[model samples]
Target: HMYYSYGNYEAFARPKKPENVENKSAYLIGSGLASLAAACFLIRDGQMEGSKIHILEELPKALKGYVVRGGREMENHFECLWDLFRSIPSLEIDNASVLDEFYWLNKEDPNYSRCRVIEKQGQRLVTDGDFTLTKTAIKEIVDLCLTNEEDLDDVKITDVFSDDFFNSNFWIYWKTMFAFEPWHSAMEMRRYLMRFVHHISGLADFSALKFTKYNQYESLVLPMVEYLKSHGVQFEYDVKVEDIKIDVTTSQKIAREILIDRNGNAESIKLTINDLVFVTNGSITESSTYGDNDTPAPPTDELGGSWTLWKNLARQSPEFGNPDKFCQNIPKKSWFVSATSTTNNKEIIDTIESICKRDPLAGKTVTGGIITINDSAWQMSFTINRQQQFKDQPENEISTWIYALYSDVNGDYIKKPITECSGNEICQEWLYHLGVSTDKIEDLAKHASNTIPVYMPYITSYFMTRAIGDRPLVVPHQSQNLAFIGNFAETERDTVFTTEYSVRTAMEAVYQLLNIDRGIPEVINSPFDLRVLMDAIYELNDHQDLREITKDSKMQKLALAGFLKKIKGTYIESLLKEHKLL
Candidate 1:
């Protein structure tokens, strides 16, 4: 209900077939995937020349961290996401698009986490994708679908569900799968429910998930960057866009000037009607700090980088949206991600495969899906990607990516907080959870493995509660030549914290501003689809016995008379049985 679902599906125009004169120039701020994708769309869809699109980033390089976000499962309905990927070539494979490569790779080795959640001492919770929610919890969840966004403005997920709700197996899977905290906006939780309703039954197994051939940066962003570069796009490195100056006097506000800091020297870029600007406001890793095996990353504060630029813009006008909503609170949204690089040490990967009960290292996917240690105080989870997650990573070198959502909290095994844990200490905590012997812990922590931890202060800040004006529209109503792109930008249904949202925002912004005449794929309307809703209802109830569904219902016989008889022996019966409702 919170979705700003504003795209025409049936009326999707073929994006104006790129048939125009090439004199227009576009400026994109913050050279992440969003800006990069905007540059690609400007050229390929807008028919603008490659050199006419300039990407300004504060960093010397782009797509470096390549972000191992919670979403790997690109479901069937990511229209704009798949649409873009299907057009871009696979970086590592020949004669295939990125989507094709992902399909092929996952088809060969689909995800099924045998050890999705483990207890203390590496005891398999053996959840087997079941919801341990009570009837009340299930009812609250289903009702959440019908809840209005405005009512949830100040509400957190914790406020809606009972205390036991957080203790359920469902919460363990749900929280770890999406990195959702109890304190996150309930609206986000609601959107996640409807947006991914079909995947609800299989989240624990990761059956509805998808994966790219390599890490996202190499597989998605890097190829897109190369494609844009080959087509003549210019990237200005170390160029910091301080603030955008917009001329609001006109009916449709237009960007007038841009103040910048290029490697410490101040500069200004003048804009005209012919120039378009796409601003990527806020960043997941702006005040990010890093540490190795021996040290903990310092506390990140006083944002002076990309987030600062976004904050400066927000202060200009309410139309810019409230950056402070997401950028200010660090502890509530931050997390620590650690990547452990190890030799194809069979011992490590072998232990992992045993947990999964499948060989992820079968010359295909080194790690099929995420493994969560549910009993840990830090709420630690990790993923073992396919071998050589990075293309340049050596054959002998394998990497496992792990993260702690509650990194500021203390650990069950270790005495120090996760934020204070060194790379080796992090490894030790993980190994202990895996039931590794103490003798083996120090060995794995030191010589056998090397871990580099990245602490992202605002990594999940976008998930914090906020009202409508908190995020600007993709193409603000009065926008003429300016658009905002990023997770902080307002969108509907398509989730934030994914490459898809960023790309969709870019596609929408470019099309709207330049009149590309393309359709932003309508948000998947699964919640409204009766079949999906019924299936979700069944799944949320743990696919319990059908008699149990009616056990407590006063209208059980009435439902039987009207609804049950209405669909008896029809296709509805088969569909009901298909969902394990019978």
Candidate 2:
């Protein structure tokens, strides 16, 4: 609910006939959210037909890590699907009415909560670092238990975390709170920790922080392609771009040709006059996670390849700024995702929850302080949002989940407290948390542990820039027609690695490159808008009444609801719609 549902769907606008623009060809490199976003801007606002758009991806994996099985689980937790839905409204189910969708989320039920967070009681989730366990996390842990009939030897959580801290019940609950793990980064963790800083005590409550979810096929990867198809967007899935031929001189914006690969064949395409080159794909999948299902797969393995076209291009041509520079510098930037299907039914679900249900103030009615978090440290969590479609078929029920690979308490990639063990050996570590017999967990956790996987061994491979030096932005120095869009592409908006970064970059690139008159949305720019909220969040990080916030006229007047009630949020539904963005 955090992304696609963030503001109104109308906030994201694309081009109409991109070909009519002064620029001839606009090429996108990858096909992830960032690339798709670029496509949206082209087809919806630029008025570009599908014929004018070309997305050059090396493989057929259109959406990257979000590919959904019949039952999707992992994609639900990442917050990308939410952005996908917001950017492309038509793909939304039942013509998504925000109010109706809000009810779906805010109705105070497990259904709404399932798609977004892990709450403590009936409605409220344990925020303020409480109630770490969510239905999603618990369900996955339970499924990690697989037995060998009479010789159960699985369950090894203790093998992962250090004995000094792993045995503590509080740590387990807290780490689960933000999906923090032993191997994740403190820097990265801090971002999410301070993100909804004002909502600290209520972070888990979906209604409070404002989050959302979506089915992958319906929300992500398809809409942009569909829109492009409707308008004739050229999509060459198997084509990997090795480099672009750009002749750089101080005068006349010198650049001659562009080249792409077609199944191991090199083709040097001619770059006609004024045909702008926009890089949509980026490098986030250097080494990603995956599920272990029955399908025979390619040997490529893991989050297989980097959308290195941009990186290679940046290296060869310094004009395109190195966006990957910030990936590893920040810790929360890297993570692990796993999608698994379980068959144990309720036995799996309840067993998982039993270990984590200390309940907290949010569930004050429920019990005591189960978790102890010092910042977003435990950093490791698992989500288990099972679909109603799996009511009768446990074998088909998938756990769409994610977990932090970093844990501040026991830091680093290899030596984390949790990584040491997998399979049933890991489950035994949870004995105390669930109040389950250590021997009992050994019955299943060890074996199933092999399947319950870790996604990011090192979170920043796809992020860390291999480019020799810094890259450039869309409107590079001494450049005329070349612009970049994804994470690797330059966007001077709020920041990268988020919904705003991807699409906002697209909007800026399209606007500048095409000289489109359409204005983009404004951020919460008023002093009356952010000053108080930020001060309250950073300066006052203690126990205080949260609702008593509006004292500063700014917070009250510029509520973020409309990017502050005074102005519109920094986004739009149609870049193609010729009118004021707001």
Candidate 3:
């Protein structure tokens, strides 16, 4: 049925857990958002006691990965994401869930950016209309979306599009928004096209993207962790999981032993038939290093020991997945993220206001969305967070973060690669793009604001060109009492590198493994809908009429006219005109 509903909380009432789950114990390998979500699902839906579940974390604190500006936005379209958050109450407000708070906040002041893309000397580009793609390029995109992932194996974006396609406004808008590279996997790009088809028309002004009130850790993760803890979830910090010793000889593979390092002692937890294990395979923020204003982040040959567990497990069977494909090229996958805070410097802030033509400190627009540099060789994009991004953040101090997709390449202004640039150097380059003078640049870089840089080597590892078998299923087939959840775990219709994907995997695993008798929400099918396809085509042509589009020979024109005439006075005519085809 083609139907839709518009409500938040009541739409998703927490269903009862599966019976007989009280006796079963489940072990979650990590304390990240995915594991936290799994634990919540285990207790809320699976009806497992909190004490019966354990979360092992390598860091002393639960989520030490929050640095260099990490936050997740929730659109109304994320079915499973909204479903989970609707039940969990907000940490700040009474009688309101987190989702309720998010909706109310965004409703009060919706995200709409005036300047989403800019060129040299802070000259904002006009992205209000038309995506400016060649007719050939538009046809290529349509054909690319129709192509299957199996056919796109090892295929790069460069493999499909012409050189002129790379120089189009669509490429600039897309590559910066999604952090995609020409050499990245075509499969992942296609998945993005399908999954985010609804956002295509709004990508220019960023009317479609949404956000949280505070940083994601404060607004999302902490509330989730506390909610789970109140129900009896146990968390063991500083515990290192070596590997999951599984019995492959059985008809169904079962997790038998968990080799762990707890307080410098090697120990093994023997598992019984009723025990369940959820392993979070692969990490984005592995072996990350932080550097201050004058220093460049140190590069590490390793992506940390956490990957060792996945590495060792892959050696056991072909089912676990091949990590080397994503992990092998650090330079290709690595990205440089920089954060700058200022109490006195209004030069950069004022420059931004001038370019955006709106005041960011006005409390109405706290970083509506990303602003991409169209002329930069680094392909840098940045965003200003709403007033007080942190809970304890000072009112006087304003901060923002930027990232470069092409960290391996030399900068347009700076003489070296962004990976080799110090925090000061990074800031200097950004100031140059904003048209700050050389005299004022050093002061803004050094004294007025402090910049901190982070190097994430394997951040985009999951986006690497890969085959179907590279990532294991959420709950692998012919497997009993074991599952994998995270970016590395394969799920259909949803793209990786998103919190939605992570939590969706958790929901799928819990519902399927525990026999909860519930259905995981289907991926929004906007790509297939004729309405969406037509509207996207119109928007791509820069909101111009169908006649304004440059088409090939009279064959397409002759066929279109005949088809329109044949469907005249029919529902098809109404649909075509409604979608602007007439």
Candidate 4:
């Protein structure tokens, strides 16, 4: 019965509202992030009528994953989203540490920066991208998290994770430095071990959590769709409410709104209901993607007109949340994001043929430009190419533009192969991963021609499979009263696909469907950061105070391998204290 996902909220926990919804009016269908957090919980706490809170968002693109870097703004999506907006003190954000000038890139390939890494006991090593050993193991984990040395340097983290070409050889270069897949979870090594204590300081919250504002529709759906259009809420974005039509002698089910003709010559727009109608656009965030700098990669099983009107209302009804059981479980629950633009004049192939001739998705097959033949070792992405943030440019210049996201357990993705596998391969295996034998991808498809290819197949299968019960706050039964937040609806254990799991699932579906208490922000266990656990226990007493030969005593061997992994209980805090669970 519990579908709380460790709190945030779920469609305002229903208990009131269906009196036809007191004088009718509450329809949000889709803009994303659970109807933009239930249209700001119906104008901030069910007072309802913020110009009737309308947001439809049919995908022209206000935002679709920031993918620019050639002029060199460094990476715009390396992950981090205002870490819950610095504790949401109503968005002014404090205790600030949005990621100051941070740099852990391990090295951008100077031939993998003097490469040499042998470890699996074969020995031999040498590394750079100094997080100063993760800032001395997060200042000894925020010095046991207390007695403030200015709040442990305001939560530090610097074992400098990557760059200098990913200090190469930490396993084929931390596998292209965190595009991940040495087996996808140690919860991202405890999430970069508490993101090294939330990046110690802010630079616009590290570029607003590196290109965020894409999910919560720009943080909580354009501020509750501009505070419900500043009051008298009555909105309509291409109208699509299909269903709830019951009346077995006044048992009352309502809803009838549908309007379509795209080009079929206008033939529908119907709505028949009274008082309160809460039929939001049905089914998961209805699939979406976009681009600019040249846009055009459309047909990839296209759906998002709000998941094709909830798979045409789950093919006439199977309980709305059944858009074929969440689009056949999101292609291995997908993940990929690529944005590239690099031109400090090494002439990255004539500024990549003027970004493939300003990319109109130049000769398709997703042309934001990619070619990594089996880099799909399960998935994760970064690919960037902006080079030190757009320096003075000019010499046939370039900055950045490569946006890639993928999740495929054999949706076959157009029968993969990219000519010969290995790193960077799409334009005919990117000239064979740049051994550049060239079958002439037609001069790199005449240098891109115009670009746009933002694909998302199954986005984390609604959170890595195997879920039952409240299934992340159940909304199916044909969604009678309708409510579906984000990060693929369902809130249970907080972190899902992220953006504070889609603004805490649109602030717990508008505080349990507008009963509101305001309560729903503090989920911050976010693992570690009391200065990255005092800099990982001071990088294990500075590896037993250094030398006897490198890896310094390896922090007393991970504290005696964490005391036999805590007396053989075995990691994950010893199986959550052996099922004493959290």
Per-candidate Cα lDDT values, in order, are: 0.75, 0.43, 0.77, 0.36
User: Which candidate order results from sorting by TM-score in descending order?
Assistant: 3, 1, 2, 4
Cα lDDT of model 3 by residue, 1-582, tens digit? 111233443256455667578779989996578888888888878889888999888777630112435436566678778878987889989999998999998898888778777787677785533477887887788788899778987888888888667878888878876778787888998998888888777877778878887778888888998898889888887789998898876478888999988878899989976788998888877887887778888766575655888898888788888888788865553464554534336667687778767676665575467788887878777777676677666565566677887777788778788878887788888888888887788778877777788877776687888888888887777777888998889888788877888888888777767777555677777887889988887787767555556355487777776876788879987886798866
Looking at model 1, the pairs that clash are: 73-209, 73-210, 366-386
Off by over 4 Å in 3: 1-16, 62-66, 126-129, 332-334, 341-343, 550-552
Compose the digit string of candidate 4's lDDT tens values, residues 1-582. Answer: 112322424223333442334453555555554455456555544566565455544433331223342111223222212222322222212342222212212121111111112222112233322222343334443344333222222121222233432322222323333333322322223333343333322211122123221122333344445545656665544344333343222343334544543232344434444322333333332343443333432324455555566556545443334554445534432443232332232333543343223322121111121222223332222222222222233434333343233433321222342111112222222222223334443334235322233444433234332223213243433333444555545444344434455555555555444435444544444333343333333233332221221244577556655565565644654443332321
Looking at model 4, how many pairs of residues clash? Answer: 124
Give each model a TM-score: 0.93, 0.61, 0.95, 0.31
lDDT of residue 328 for candidate 2: 35
What is candidate 1's lDDT per residue for 368-408, written digit by digit as tens?
Answer: 57788877888888777766667666566566677887766
Output the lDDT of residue 372, model 2.
23
Model 1 TM: 0.93
Stretches of candidate 2 above 4 Å error?
Answer: 1-23, 61-201, 204-218, 251-255, 289-308, 316-319, 323-343, 352-379, 386-404, 407-435, 446-454, 461-471, 526-582
Off by more than 4 A, model 1? 1-13, 17-21, 61-73, 332-334, 337-344, 569-571
lDDT of 2: 0.43
Backbone clash count for every predicted candidate, in the order shown: 3, 98, 2, 124
